Amino acid sequence: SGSYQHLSNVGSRVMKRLGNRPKNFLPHSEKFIKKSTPEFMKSDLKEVDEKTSFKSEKEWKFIPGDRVVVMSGASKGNIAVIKSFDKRTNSFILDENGPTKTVPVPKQFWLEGQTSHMITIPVSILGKDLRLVATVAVRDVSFNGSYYDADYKKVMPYRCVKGQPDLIIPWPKPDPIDVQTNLATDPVIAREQTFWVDSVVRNPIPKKAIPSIRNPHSKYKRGTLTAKDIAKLVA
Protein backbone atom coordinates (compact mmCIF):
# COMPACT_ATOMS: atom_id res chain seq x y z
CA SER A 1 0.00 0.00 0.00
CA GLY A 2 2.52 2.60 1.22
CA SER A 3 -0.36 4.28 3.02
CA TYR A 4 0.20 5.68 6.55
CA GLN A 5 -3.63 6.20 6.71
CA HIS A 6 -3.86 3.49 9.40
CA LEU A 7 -1.88 5.60 11.96
CA SER A 8 -4.50 8.41 12.07
CA ASN A 9 -8.13 9.39 11.32
CA VAL A 10 -7.63 11.91 8.50
CA GLY A 11 -10.38 13.05 6.11
CA SER A 12 -12.91 11.90 8.70
CA ARG A 13 -16.09 13.39 7.21
CA VAL A 14 -15.29 11.91 3.79
CA MET A 15 -14.70 8.47 5.36
CA LYS A 16 -18.02 8.70 7.24
CA ARG A 17 -19.85 9.58 4.00
CA LEU A 18 -18.25 6.64 2.19
CA GLY A 19 -18.78 4.25 5.10
CA ASN A 20 -22.41 5.21 5.71
CA ARG A 21 -23.64 4.98 2.12
CA PRO A 22 -27.42 5.36 1.70
CA LYS A 23 -29.22 2.02 1.66
CA ASN A 24 -31.19 2.72 -1.54
CA PHE A 25 -27.85 3.07 -3.43
CA LEU A 26 -26.49 -0.13 -1.83
CA PRO A 27 -26.89 -2.16 -5.07
CA HIS A 28 -24.85 0.51 -6.89
CA SER A 29 -22.11 0.30 -4.25
CA GLU A 30 -21.93 -3.52 -4.26
CA LYS A 31 -22.23 -4.07 -8.06
CA PHE A 32 -18.65 -2.87 -8.58
CA ILE A 33 -17.41 -4.76 -5.49
CA LYS A 34 -18.88 -7.99 -6.93
CA LYS A 35 -17.16 -7.31 -10.26
CA SER A 36 -13.83 -6.68 -8.48
CA THR A 37 -13.89 -9.91 -6.42
CA PRO A 38 -12.82 -13.26 -7.97
CA GLU A 39 -15.32 -16.16 -8.17
CA PHE A 40 -13.70 -18.14 -5.32
CA MET A 41 -13.93 -15.11 -2.98
CA LYS A 42 -17.39 -13.69 -3.72
CA SER A 43 -20.54 -14.88 -1.91
CA ASP A 44 -24.18 -14.83 -3.07
CA LEU A 45 -25.64 -13.82 0.32
CA LYS A 46 -26.23 -10.20 1.37
CA GLU A 47 -23.63 -8.61 3.68
CA VAL A 48 -25.92 -7.36 6.49
CA ASP A 49 -25.10 -4.30 8.64
CA GLU A 50 -23.74 -4.62 12.22
CA LYS A 51 -27.09 -3.37 13.61
CA THR A 52 -28.95 -6.33 12.06
CA SER A 53 -26.37 -8.92 13.14
CA PHE A 54 -26.98 -11.98 15.34
CA LYS A 55 -24.66 -11.25 18.29
CA SER A 56 -26.50 -13.34 20.92
CA GLU A 57 -26.76 -17.16 20.87
CA LYS A 58 -30.57 -16.70 20.98
CA GLU A 59 -30.44 -14.63 17.75
CA TRP A 60 -28.49 -17.42 16.06
CA LYS A 61 -30.83 -20.42 16.24
CA PHE A 62 -27.81 -22.78 15.81
CA ILE A 63 -24.21 -22.91 17.16
CA PRO A 64 -21.03 -24.20 15.44
CA GLY A 65 -20.94 -27.92 16.33
CA ASP A 66 -24.65 -28.86 16.18
CA ARG A 67 -26.11 -31.17 13.53
CA VAL A 68 -28.54 -29.65 10.99
CA VAL A 69 -30.59 -30.86 7.98
CA VAL A 70 -30.33 -28.72 4.82
CA MET A 71 -33.33 -27.78 2.66
CA SER A 72 -34.48 -25.22 0.03
CA GLY A 73 -31.37 -25.92 -2.08
CA ALA A 74 -29.44 -28.27 -4.37
CA SER A 75 -28.10 -30.45 -1.53
CA LYS A 76 -31.49 -30.66 0.22
CA GLY A 77 -32.44 -33.37 2.71
CA ASN A 78 -28.75 -33.59 3.71
CA ILE A 79 -27.52 -33.80 7.31
CA ALA A 80 -24.54 -31.55 8.07
CA VAL A 81 -22.60 -30.51 11.19
CA ILE A 82 -22.26 -26.71 11.00
CA LYS A 83 -18.59 -25.71 11.15
CA SER A 84 -18.50 -21.93 11.73
CA PHE A 85 -20.80 -18.93 11.17
CA ASP A 86 -19.95 -15.80 9.18
CA LYS A 87 -20.59 -12.65 11.21
CA ARG A 88 -20.99 -10.03 8.45
CA THR A 89 -23.37 -12.16 6.31
CA ASN A 90 -25.47 -13.80 9.10
CA SER A 91 -24.96 -17.33 7.77
CA PHE A 92 -23.33 -20.70 8.47
CA ILE A 93 -20.49 -22.64 6.81
CA LEU A 94 -21.40 -26.34 6.81
CA ASP A 95 -19.15 -29.41 6.54
CA GLU A 96 -18.54 -31.56 3.39
CA ASN A 97 -22.19 -32.75 3.24
CA GLY A 98 -23.61 -29.19 2.99
CA PRO A 99 -23.96 -26.99 -0.12
CA THR A 100 -20.76 -26.37 -2.11
CA LYS A 101 -19.40 -24.79 -5.30
CA THR A 102 -16.49 -25.95 -7.48
CA VAL A 103 -14.30 -22.93 -8.34
CA PRO A 104 -10.76 -22.40 -9.72
CA VAL A 105 -8.21 -21.35 -7.08
CA PRO A 106 -4.62 -19.99 -7.36
CA LYS A 107 -1.55 -21.86 -6.05
CA GLN A 108 -1.26 -19.37 -3.16
CA PHE A 109 -4.41 -21.01 -1.69
CA TRP A 110 -3.70 -24.66 -2.64
CA LEU A 111 -4.29 -27.42 -0.08
CA GLU A 112 -1.70 -30.20 0.27
CA GLY A 113 -2.82 -33.00 -2.07
CA GLN A 114 -4.26 -31.15 -5.08
CA THR A 115 -3.92 -32.02 -8.78
CA SER A 116 -6.13 -29.33 -10.36
CA HIS A 117 -6.77 -25.61 -9.75
CA MET A 118 -10.44 -26.58 -9.46
CA ILE A 119 -11.52 -27.06 -5.81
CA THR A 120 -14.94 -27.58 -4.20
CA ILE A 121 -15.60 -25.04 -1.40
CA PRO A 122 -18.60 -24.63 0.93
CA VAL A 123 -21.06 -21.81 0.20
CA SER A 124 -22.65 -19.90 3.07
CA ILE A 125 -26.30 -20.59 3.99
CA LEU A 126 -28.87 -18.80 6.17
CA GLY A 127 -30.56 -20.10 9.33
CA LYS A 128 -33.90 -19.85 7.50
CA ASP A 129 -32.83 -22.40 4.86
CA LEU A 130 -31.82 -25.20 7.31
CA ARG A 131 -33.62 -26.95 10.20
CA LEU A 132 -32.26 -28.76 13.31
CA VAL A 133 -32.03 -32.53 13.84
CA ALA A 134 -32.11 -34.80 16.92
CA THR A 135 -33.51 -39.37 13.56
CA VAL A 136 -35.99 -36.46 13.69
CA ALA A 137 -35.79 -32.93 12.22
CA VAL A 138 -37.15 -29.92 14.16
CA ARG A 139 -39.54 -27.45 12.48
CA ASP A 140 -38.84 -24.52 14.82
CA VAL A 141 -37.08 -23.93 18.15
CA SER A 142 -38.05 -21.53 20.97
CA PHE A 143 -36.18 -20.24 24.04
CA ASN A 144 -37.94 -20.00 27.44
CA GLY A 145 -35.40 -20.66 30.25
CA SER A 146 -31.70 -19.96 30.82
CA TYR A 147 -28.72 -21.42 32.72
CA TYR A 148 -24.95 -21.25 33.23
CA ASP A 149 -23.11 -23.67 30.91
CA ALA A 150 -20.01 -25.43 32.26
CA ASP A 151 -18.20 -25.80 28.91
CA TYR A 152 -19.38 -22.63 27.11
CA LYS A 153 -18.95 -20.49 30.28
CA LYS A 154 -22.02 -18.35 29.55
CA VAL A 155 -25.59 -17.93 30.84
CA MET A 156 -27.06 -19.60 27.74
CA PRO A 157 -30.78 -20.19 27.06
CA TYR A 158 -32.57 -23.56 26.79
CA ARG A 159 -33.28 -24.56 23.16
CA CYS A 160 -36.79 -26.02 23.35
CA VAL A 161 -38.79 -27.40 20.41
CA LYS A 162 -41.66 -25.06 19.43
CA GLY A 163 -44.98 -26.16 20.95
CA GLN A 164 -43.88 -28.74 23.54
CA PRO A 165 -41.33 -26.91 25.77
CA ASP A 166 -40.04 -29.94 27.76
CA LEU A 167 -38.37 -31.49 24.67
CA ILE A 168 -34.99 -29.75 25.03
CA ILE A 169 -32.58 -29.68 22.08
CA PRO A 170 -29.23 -29.53 23.93
CA TRP A 171 -26.30 -27.32 22.89
CA PRO A 172 -23.26 -28.98 21.25
CA LYS A 173 -20.36 -29.30 23.72
CA PRO A 174 -17.44 -27.35 22.14
CA ASP A 175 -13.82 -28.42 21.66
CA PRO A 176 -11.45 -28.01 24.65
CA ILE A 177 -9.42 -24.79 24.22
CA ASP A 178 -5.95 -25.98 25.32
CA VAL A 179 -4.46 -22.55 26.04
CA GLN A 180 -0.65 -22.23 25.95
CA THR A 181 0.17 -18.59 25.17
CA ASN A 182 2.53 -16.10 26.82
CA LEU A 183 0.00 -13.23 26.43
CA ALA A 184 -2.83 -14.93 28.42
CA THR A 185 -2.62 -14.84 32.24
CA ASP A 186 -3.58 -18.12 33.97
CA PRO A 187 -6.84 -18.55 36.00
CA VAL A 188 -5.25 -18.34 39.48
CA ILE A 189 -3.37 -15.05 38.94
CA ALA A 190 -6.08 -13.49 36.71
CA ARG A 191 -8.63 -13.58 39.56
CA GLU A 192 -6.49 -13.36 42.75
CA GLN A 193 -7.69 -10.42 44.86
CA THR A 194 -4.91 -7.94 45.72
CA PHE A 195 -7.18 -4.96 46.61
CA TRP A 196 -9.55 -4.42 49.54
CA VAL A 197 -11.58 -1.32 50.43
CA ASP A 198 -10.00 -0.58 53.83
CA SER A 199 -9.01 3.08 54.30
CA VAL A 200 -11.27 6.13 54.47
CA VAL A 201 -8.27 8.38 55.34
CA ARG A 202 -5.73 7.33 52.68
CA ASN A 203 -7.13 7.37 49.14
CA PRO A 204 -6.37 4.16 47.22
CA ILE A 205 -4.66 5.49 44.07
CA PRO A 206 -2.24 8.47 44.33
CA LYS A 207 -2.94 12.16 43.66
CA LYS A 208 -0.37 12.45 40.84
CA ALA A 209 -2.11 9.59 38.95
CA ILE A 210 -5.54 11.36 38.83
CA PRO A 211 -4.84 13.45 35.65
CA SER A 212 -4.36 10.22 33.64
CA ILE A 213 -7.54 8.71 35.15
CA ARG A 214 -9.78 11.74 34.44
CA ASN A 215 -9.56 15.14 32.76
CA PRO A 216 -9.19 17.83 35.48
CA HIS A 217 -10.23 20.57 33.00
CA SER A 218 -13.41 18.83 31.81
CA LYS A 219 -15.80 21.28 30.10
CA TYR A 220 -18.73 18.92 30.89
CA LYS A 221 -18.42 18.90 34.71
CA ARG A 222 -20.31 22.05 35.74
CA GLY A 223 -19.68 23.69 39.13
CA THR A 224 -22.42 23.92 41.77
CA LEU A 225 -23.82 27.31 42.84
CA THR A 226 -23.32 29.03 46.22
CA ALA A 227 -25.26 31.73 48.12
CA LYS A 228 -22.69 34.44 47.32
CA ASP A 229 -22.72 33.48 43.62
CA ILE A 230 -26.54 33.70 43.60
CA ALA A 231 -26.37 37.15 45.22
CA LYS A 232 -23.85 38.30 42.60
CA LEU A 233 -26.08 36.99 39.79
CA VAL A 234 -29.36 38.50 41.01
CA ALA A 235 -29.95 42.27 40.90
Binding site: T181, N182, A184, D186, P187
Partner: peptide
Protein backbone atom coordinates in the same frame (compact mmCIF):
# COMPACT_ATOMS: atom_id res chain seq x y z
CA UNK B 1 -0.83 -10.29 30.92
CA UNK B 2 -2.78 -8.15 28.40
CA UNK B 3 -5.29 -11.01 27.92
CA UNK B 4 -6.91 -13.47 30.32
CA UNK B 5 -7.12 -17.22 29.67
CA UNK B 6 -10.53 -17.83 28.05
CA UNK B 7 -11.09 -20.90 30.27
CA UNK B 8 -11.75 -18.29 32.98
Amino acid sequence: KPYVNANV
